[model samples]
Target: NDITQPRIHTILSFFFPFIGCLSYLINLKYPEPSLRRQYAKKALCVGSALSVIYSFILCSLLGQYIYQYDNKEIYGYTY
Candidate 1:
């Protein structure tokens, strides 16, 4: 019952983000889903949310950098 239920590691989840979310979903057949949600409220809201937001930002930066392929060209470029 409790052994197989959804549980979490607070400090680890906060510092480790994705792996925390990864492990959080390992055991999903819990008696009360709300309790599991409650346990993961902050972890998902902060660590997980931050990771998703960071991914979007990193992709945007990479896309911009790729588009400006000649920005790094120092020979013909005038500073």
Candidate 2:
């Protein structure tokens, strides 16, 4: 397998080992009986998508804080 592929697999594993294993197995034996692989792939994709969305929202919120700190007197708001 390629190095990048393992990196993706590792990330998926960190997020959800069971799903990661399933995806790996399916991809390993593609075009074969692969219920576990299918389910794992789906779960990993869904989880990663949700995590990215959540992180985006969180980063936006954090950006607001950064802006406030950057211009403390502009809005006359202080902590």
Candidate 3:
């Protein structure tokens, strides 16, 4: 079930959860059926963790301060 090509996955999965999932699947190739699923879960868990961490970094870095809302409209009621 090596449906995913990992290079692409590492790039995006270093950025998104789904790609991370694919990365997980790509690596889980145990011959034993039981072992495969077991290891798959482990890989997927690690993938998800890294994916979430990196995703947070991207979001945090990409944020832009629109403006100083010191005197912006507040529910049409001045503060």
Q: Model 1 clash pairs?
A: none
State the C-alpha lDDT per candidate: 0.56, 0.56, 0.56
Residue pairs with clashing backbones, model 3: none
Q: Candidate 2, overall lDDT?
A: 0.56
Specify the highest-TM-score model's number.
2
Residue 43, model 2, lDDT: 51
TM-score, structure 3 vs. true: 0.43
| Backbone collisions counted per model | 0, 0, 0
Per-prediction TM-score to the true structure, in the order listed: 0.44, 0.46, 0.43
lDDT tens digits, residues 1-79, model 2?
2335534554666555454545555465543345544554555665566567667877898987785476545455455
Q: Sorted by TM-score, highest first, which candidate order results?
A: 2, 1, 3
Report the lDDT tens digits of candidate 1 across residue range 1-79. Answer: 3422234454555455675466446534544455665555444556577678777887899887775566756544542
- Cα lDDT tens digits for candidate 3, 13-39: 544567657755656664535544544
lDDT of 3 at 31: 52
